[PDB]
Design brief:
The structure is cut from a larger assembly and holds chains A, B, C, D and E.
Chain A: H1 2-22, H2 25-36
Chain B: H1 4-7, H2 11-33
Chain E: H1 2-15, H2 30-43
The chains are: A mainly alpha, B mainly alpha, C alpha/beta, D alpha/beta, E mainly alpha.
The structure holds adenosine-5'-triphosphate, adenosine-5'-diphosphate and magnesium ion (2 copies).
Chain lengths: ~40, ~35, ~475, ~475, ~70
C-alpha cells in the first residue's frame, strides 16, 4: 500500500509538472508592477 | 651502534628483554629470601 | 493523494521575489568556480548557483571569488548567475536529527521526509575557551573490556582510534555506539549518551550496512549518521565533520552528553587537499595544504566537558585515522596524535594472532586515565594493568595469558561495566589459572549467563554503588568459587 | 553549436565557441577527420573557451579546425544486442560484425545510486579456490578487488574466476578490458567463442565485451571503464538481471587520469597523481554496486605500481571493496600459486554469523598459525631451525604444510603447467584445513600438500612420494 | 498568478480520475511489476493474501532411563 501511494504520488508530480508547462502580456504587466514595488 | 638489537624491537629484542627479566626476577627472588 | 501535494505544498511556497546580490561565473572546473562580481560576499559564505547547487566562497581575491561547489560542476556553465545567501555555512541541529541519516549539509538522505528542525548552527564555530570547561570525570563506557579497563575514556575527551586498514576501528566505534542503549532507555538523564557517526569518504553500501547494524540493535533511535561518501563532492566530505560536530555541540550546550565518531579524518584530509590544490593554494608535505593541522585541531578542540554554569554537558570525540603499513610517523597521523587526549593503537599482527580487538596495550594510552573510571573498575583494572605489563615483560606467565585471553571480545557485544568487573575479578583473583587458556573464553560466556540469571542483585549493587564493598567482594568471591567448582 | 580548435597539447584540446558553449561532459565531434574523433568537455576556461579530453589520437589536428557539439555526453548503445559484441570507449563496434542495433542509448556519465537504493544481502559466492573461499570469501552482489604487482597472477586469477563463476552464472556478464594487452582481449574473445559463451550466429550470447587497451590514448583509457559500467548498469536496472562485471585493469583508469592531469593545468598531488584521484575513483566506483533494483557482482584487478601497496591508487581502491585478494610477489617466488597473501586478504562476510562457526574457526586458526610462523621467521633465518622449542617447530611445520595446501592448480594454468585444474568445494576446503590444523597429517611431508586439490589428493601424493 | 493556475487547473485535472486508476499514466507498469516482484520475493514466497496455515512439530526425546 505504501509503495503504491509513493509511486502514484511521484507520477502525479511528474504529470502535473509536464502538463503545467504546456499551459500572456499580463505576466509582463504584473512583473513590471512588482519591479515597481521593489523599493 | 651499541644496544641496537634491543633498540630495533625485533624478534631478538623481545627475547633479550625476556631473558633479562627472567634472569633478574629469579635473582630478585633469590635475593629477597636471603634478606 | 491530491491533498498532500496541494493543501499547502503549493499554497505555501514563498513565491515572493527579492533583489539578489549576484556574480557571474568566469570559469568552472573540477568543482571550482571562479566568479566575477559578488562584491559584498563574505569569506566562507554560502552562495547558490542558478541550477539549485550551493557552494562556499573560500578564496576572496581582488578580481574573482573562488567558490567550491557542494555538488556536481556538470550543471554550472560559464556565465551562470551566482546569488548570495548572506549567511555563513550552517546546518540544522536539534533532537529531530536523532534516528535520521543526513548528508553533510543536513538534508535527509534516508527517504523519511524533512527533519522538523527549527534550530540552525554554524559549522565553523569556535571551541569553548578555558573558563567554560571543567575536568573530565564522568566515564564514557565503550562496552569493550580492553578499552574500558586499560584505556578508559571520559566524557569530554578526544580519544583517537588509529590503525591500518581492516584492523577493527569502525568495530570499536560501533560497539561504543551500541553500548549506550542500556543508559539511553534508563531513567538517569545525566547518563544518556547521544551518538553521532560521521562517515567521510566511505562506500555508500558500507554506510548502509552500518545503519542496518545500528537499527538491528535499536541504536538508531539516539544516533545521527552524517554521510559524505566517496561520490560526494570534496567540499561535502570536508564539511561533514564540522556539521556533525555542530549537531553534537547542540547537545553539549544544553546539559546533554554526546559522542561523535569521525570515520575517518584521513579522508577528510584528502578532500581538503583536493579542494586546496584546485583552489591553487601551494602544496606542503605530501601535497597537503599548510594548515591541515589547523583543519583537525579546530575540529577536535570542540569536544569538551563543560562546567555547571554552562549546563554540565559534554561532547566526546573518537576520531579515526588509517595508517599505511603501520607508519604512525606519517604527516596526518602525527598531527592527530599530537592533538588528541590519547590513542587506541590497533595492529595487524595482533589481529591475526587472535587478539580481537587488536588493541596494542603497550602503545594505547588515555591521558585522562583512572580519573574517568568507576571505583570498581579501577580496583580490578590497576592490578590487571600491572600484571599485563609484567606478562609483556617476559612473554608470572599463566596469569598473563589468562588476562590476555580474557581481554578478547566478540563483535557487536558490548558488555556492561558490572559484568566486565565480575569477569576481570574472576580472572585477576586466580579463579582462571586452574583452567587451560583454550577454554577460558567459553567459561566466561557460561559465567556471564549464570551471573545474569541468578545474581542480578550483586550486579545491581555494583552498578548503584559504583565500587565493590568487602561484603559484595565476598559475595562475588563465593559465587565465582562455586561456579568454578561446578564448571 | 560549432567551435574551433585553439590549442592541442597531447590528449587535451582547447575549443573556442562563438555561441552556445557546451556543458561540461558533453561530447564534441571534430570535423575533417577520417574516423570519429570525440572530445569530452572537462573544464570551462573562460572567454568562451572549453578544455576537452580527446577519446582518440590528436595527430593531424590544426588550430582552427571545426568542432560540432552533440548536445549530450558520450552515448553508447545499451541493450541485449550488445551481448556477444565488442565495442570501444565510444560504443562503436570493433568486431567487424556490423552495427549494434539497440533501441536505446545511455550516456556513460550518470549519477551514482542513492543511499535508499542500497542492498544489504551478503550471501557467499563459492569460487572453488581454496585460499579465497577459506580466508577471504567472496559475496554475491559484492565488490571483489584483486591486488597485485607486475606478473603475479591477476589476469590468471580473473580468468579462473570467469571460468569458475561466469559459465555457472545464470545472468549476464560484462568484461571491461581497461588498459591491458590487446592479445589478451583477442584470447578472451576467441576462448569465449570456443566455449559457447559468445555465439556468433544467434542471440544466446551471455557476455558483452568493452575494450580500451594499453595502446589507446589516455582519454579512451580513462572512459572505457565508464562505458563498461554503463552496459552493466543497463543490465542491472532496466533488465533487473544479476550481472557479473570483470574489470581488468581498473588501476589504468586512475593512471590515465594522471596522464592528463598535468595538461588540464592542475597542481600535482602526492607521487605526481591528480589532486582529484579519490573523488574520480569514488564517482566511478559508486556506480559499480548492487541496488535493490538488481545485483552486480564485480571483480576488479588492481595493479600495484612497483609492488607498493601504499601507492595512492591501490590505497584509495582498498576502501571501495567488499573482498580484497592481495597477491604477493614474495609468495609467487616460493612457487605458491595463486600468490594470495593470506594475512593481507580480507572479506566482510568472514563473520561467524554469515559463514558458520566452523568456517570462521578454521580460517582464524589458519591465519593465527601463519602469523606465528611469520613472527618466528627472523630467528629461523639467523639462528637456524634448531634453536626453537618443540611447539615452535610444530608450529613451523604445520604452517608450512598450510602454506603449501593453500596453493592450487588452475584450469587456465593447465596449458603451461600440465597439472589438471582443481575446483575444490567449500566443505572439502574447510575439512582439509581443519584436519591439517588438528595434526592428522603431521607425519606426511610438506611437499605432499603442494599443488593439490582436496586433502585426499594430498595423502595420495604423500603415498606416491614414499 | 500562474502558480495558482497550476494549482487549480491541475487539481481539477487530476480529480478527473474516476475512469482511470493512476491518473492518466499510460505507462509505469513495466517497472512497477519488477518492483512488486522484488518486494514480494523479499517479503516471502507464499501467497500473502490469505491466512497462514500452521504446521507444527514436537520435540524429540530419547531413552533417558537408567541403563
Ligand atoms: N573484536 C572483533 N572480533 C572479531 N572480528 C572483528 C573484531 N573487530 C573487527 N572484526 C572484524 O575484522 C574486520 C575489520 O573490519 P572493521 O570495519 O571493523 O575495521 P576498519 O579499520 O574500519 O577497516 P576499513 O577501514 O579498511 O574498512 C571486520 O570484518 C570485522 O568484522
Ligand atoms: N595460478 C597460477 N599458476 C601458475 N602460474 C601462475 C599462476 N598465476 C600466475 N602465474 C604465473 O605468473 C605469470 C603472469 O600471469 P598474469 O596473471 O598474466 O600476470 P598479471 O598479474 O600481470 O596479470 C603467468 O604467466 C604465470 O607464469
Ligand atoms: Mg572502517
Ligand atoms: Mg594482467
Amino acid at each position: 500500500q505504501n509503495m503504491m501511494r509513493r509511486k502514484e504520488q511521484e507520477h502525479m508530480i511528474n504529470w502535473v509538472e509536464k502538463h503545467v508547462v504546456q499551459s500572456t502580456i499580463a505576466k509582463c504587466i504584473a512583473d513590471l508592477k512588482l519591479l515597481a514595488k521593489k523599493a | 651502534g651499541a644496544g641496537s638489537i634491543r633498540e630495533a624491537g625485533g624478534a631478538f629484542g623481545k627475547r633479550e628483554q625476556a631473558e633479562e627479566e627472567r634472569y633478574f626476577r629469579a635473582q630478585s627472588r633469590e635475593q629477597l629470601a636471603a634478606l | 493523494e491530491m491533498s498532500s501535494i496541494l493543501e499547502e505544498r503549493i499554497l505555501g511556497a514563498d513565491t515572493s521575489v527579492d533583489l539578489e546580490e549576484t556574480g557571474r561565473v568566469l570559469s568552472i572546473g573540477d568543482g571550482i568556480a571562479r566568479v566575477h562580481g559578488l562584491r559584498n560576499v563574505q569569506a566562507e559564505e554560502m552562495v547558490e548557483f542558478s541550477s539549485g547547487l550551493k557552494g562556499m566562497s573560500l578564496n576572496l581575491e581582488p578580481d574573482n571569488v573562488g567558490v567550491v561547489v557542494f555538488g556536481n560542476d556538470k550543471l554550472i556553465k560559464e556565465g551562470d548567475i551566482v546569488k548570495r545567501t548572506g549567511a555563513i555555512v550552517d546546518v540544522p541541529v536539534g533532537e529531530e536529527l536523532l534516528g535520521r541519516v543526513v548528508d553533510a549539509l543536513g538534508n535527509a538522505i534516508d527517504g523519511k521526509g524533512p527533519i522538523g528542525s527549527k534550530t540552525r548552527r554554524r559549522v565553523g564555530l569556535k571551541a569553548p575557551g578555558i573558563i567554560p570547561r571543567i575536568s573530565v570525570r564522568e566515564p564514557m563506557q565503550t562496552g569493550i573490556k580492553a578499552v574500558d579497563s586499560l584505556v578508559p575514556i571520559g566524557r569530554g575527551q578526544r580519544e583517537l582510534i588509529i590503525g591500518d586498514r581492516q584492523t577493527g576501528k569502525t568495530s570499536i566505534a560501533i560497539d561504543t555506539i551500541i553500548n549506550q542503549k542500556r543508559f539511553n532507555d534508563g531513567s538517569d538523564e545525566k547518563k544518556k549518551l547521544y551518538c553521532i557517526y560521521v562517515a567521510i569518504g566511505q562506500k555508500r553500501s558500507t554506510v548502509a550496512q552500518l545503519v542496518k547494524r545500528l537499527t538491528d540493535a535499536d541504536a538508531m533511535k539516539y544516533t545521527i549518521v552524517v554521510s559524505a561518501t566517496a561520490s560526494d563532492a570534496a567540499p561535502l566530505q570536508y564539511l561533514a565533520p564540522y556539521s556533525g560536530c555542530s549537531m553534537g555541540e547542540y547537545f553539549r550546550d544544553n546539559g546533554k552528553h554526546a559522542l561523535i565518531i569521525y570515520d575517518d579524518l584521513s579522508k577528510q584530509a584528502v578532500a581538503y587537499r583536493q579542494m586546496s590544490l584546485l583552489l591553487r593554494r601551494p602544496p606542503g608535505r605530501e601535497a597537503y595544504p599548510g594548515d591541515v593541522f589547523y583543519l583537525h585541531s579546530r575540529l577536535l578542540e570542540r569536544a569538551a566537558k563543560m562546567n555547571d554554569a554552562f549546563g554540565g554537558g559534554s561532547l566526546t570525540a573518537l576520531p579515526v585515522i588509517e595508517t599505511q603499513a603501520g607508519d604512525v610517523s606519517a604527516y596526518i597521523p602525527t598531527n592527530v596524535i599530537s592533538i588528541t587526549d590519547g590513542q587506541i593503537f590497533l595492529e595487524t599482527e595482533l589481529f591475526y594472532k587472535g587478539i580481537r580487538p587488536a588493541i596494542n596495550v603497550g602503545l594505547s594510552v588515555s591521558r585522562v586515565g583512572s580519573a574517568a573510571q568507576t571505583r570498581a573498575m579501577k580496583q580490578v583494572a590497576g592490578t590487571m594493568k600491572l600484571e599485563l605489563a609484567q606478562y609483556r615483560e617476559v612473554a608470572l606467565l599463566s596469569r598473563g595469558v589468562r588476562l590476555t585471553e580474557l581481554l578478547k571480545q566478540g563483535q557487536y557485544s558490548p558488555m556492561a561495566i558490572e559484568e566486565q568487573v565480575a569477569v576481570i575479578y574472576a580472572g585477576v583473583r586466580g579463579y582462571l589459572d586452574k583452567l587451560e587458556p583454550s577454554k577460558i573464553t567459553k567459561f566466561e560466556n557460561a559465567f556471564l549467563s549464570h551471573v545474569v540469571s541468578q545474581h542480578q542483585a550483586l550486579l545491581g549493587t555494583i552498578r548503584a554503588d559504583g565500587k565493590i564493598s568487602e561484603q559484595s567482594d565476598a559475595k562475588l568471591k563465593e559465587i565465582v568459587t562455586n561456579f568454578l567448582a561446578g564448571f | 553549436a560549432t567551435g574551433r580548435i585553439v590549442a592541442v597539447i597531447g590528449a587535451v584540446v582547447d575549443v573556442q565557441f562563438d555561441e552556445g558553449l557546451p556543458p561540461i561532459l558533453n561530447a564534441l565531434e571534430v570535423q575533417g577527420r577520417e574516423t570519429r574523433l570525440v572530445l569530452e568537455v572537462a573544464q570551462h576556461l573562460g572567454e568562451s573557451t572549453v578544455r576537452t579530453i580527446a577519446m582518440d589520437g590528436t595527430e593531424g589536428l590544426v588550430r582552427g579546425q571545426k568542432v560540432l557539439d552533440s548536445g549530450a555526453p558520450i552515448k553508447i548503445p545499451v541493450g541485449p544486442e550488445t551481448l556477444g559484441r565488442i565495442m570501444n570507449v565510444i560504443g562503436e563496434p570493433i568486431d567487424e560484425r556490423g552495427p549494434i542495433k539497440t533501441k536505446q542509448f545511455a550516456p556513460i556519465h550518470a549519477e551514482a545510486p542513492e543511499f535508499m537504493e542500497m542492498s544489504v544481502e551478503q550471501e557467499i559466492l563459492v569460487t572453488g579456490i581454496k585460499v579465497v573461499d577459506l580466508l577471504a570469501p567472496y559475496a554475491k552482489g559484492g565488490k571483489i578487488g584483486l591486488f597485485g604487482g607486475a606478473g603475479v597472477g591477476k589476469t590468471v586469477l580473473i580468468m579462473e574466476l570467469i571460468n569458475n563463476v561466469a559459465k555457472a552464472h545464470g545472468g549476464y556478464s560484462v568484461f571491461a578490458g581497461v588498459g591491458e594487452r590487446t592479445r589478451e582481449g583477442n584470447d578472451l574473445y576467441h576462448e569465449m567463442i570456443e566455449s559457447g559463451v559468445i555465439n556468433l550466429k544467434d542471440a544466446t550470447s551471455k557476455v558483452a565485451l568493452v575494450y580500451g587497451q594499453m595502446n589507446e590514448p589516455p582519454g579512451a583509457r580513462a572512459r572505457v571503464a565508464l562505458t563498461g559500467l554503463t552496459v552493466a548498469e543497463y543490465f542491472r536496472d532496466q533488465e533487473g538481471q544479476d550481472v557479473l562485471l570483470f574489470i581488468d585493469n581498473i588501476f589504468r583508469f586512475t593512471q590515465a587520469g594522471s596522464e592528463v592531469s598535468a595538461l588540464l593545468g592542475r597542481i600535482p598531488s602526492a607521487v605526481g597523481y591528480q589532486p582529484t584521484l579519490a573523488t574520480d575513483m569514488g564517482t566511478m566506483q559508486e556506480r559499480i554496486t548492487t541496488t535493490k533494483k538488481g545485483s552486480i557482482t564485480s571483480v576488479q584487478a588492481i595493479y600495484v605500481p612497483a609492488d607498493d601497496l601504499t601507492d595512492p591508487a591501490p590505497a584509495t581502491t582498498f576502501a571501495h571493496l567488499d573482498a580484497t585478494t592481495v597477491l604477493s610477489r614474495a609468495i609467487a617466488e616460493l612457487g605458491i600459486y595463486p600468490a594470495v597473501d593470506p594475512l593481507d586478504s580480507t572479506s566482510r562476510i568472514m563473520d561467524p554469523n554469515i559463514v558458520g562457526s566452523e568456517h570462521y574457526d578454521v580460517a582464524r586458526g589458519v591465519q593465527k598459525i601463519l602469523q606465528d610462523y611469520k613472527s618466528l621467521q627472523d630467528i629461523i633465518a639467523i639462528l637456524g631451525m634448531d634453536e626453537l622449542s618443540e611447539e615452535d617447530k610444530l608450529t613451523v611445520s604445520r604452517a608450512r604444510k598450510i602454506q603449501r595446501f593453500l596453493s592450487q592448480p588452475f584450469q587456465v594454468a593447465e596449458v603451461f603447467t600440465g597439472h589438471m585444474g582443481k575446483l575444490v568445494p567449500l566443505k572439502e576446503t574447510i575439512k582439509g584445513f581443519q584436519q591439517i590444523l588438528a595434526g592428522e597429517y603431521d607425519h606426511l611431508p610438506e611437499q605432499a600438500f603442494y599443488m593439490v586439490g582436496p586433502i585426499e589428493e594430498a595423502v595420495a601424493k604423500a603415498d606416491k612420494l614414499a | 498568478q500562474k502558480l495558482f493556475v497550476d494549482k487549480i487547473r491541475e487539481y481539477k485535472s487530476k480529480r478527473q480520475t474516476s475512469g482511470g486508476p493512476v491518473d492518466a499514466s499510460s505507462e509505469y507498469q513495466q517497472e512497477l511489476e519488477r518492483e512488486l516482484f522484488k518486494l514480494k520475493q523479499m517479503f516471502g514466497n507464499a501467497d500473502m493474501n490469505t491466512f497462514p496455515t500452521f504446521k507444527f512439530e514436537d520435540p524429540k526425546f530419547e531413552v533417558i532411563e537408567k541403563p
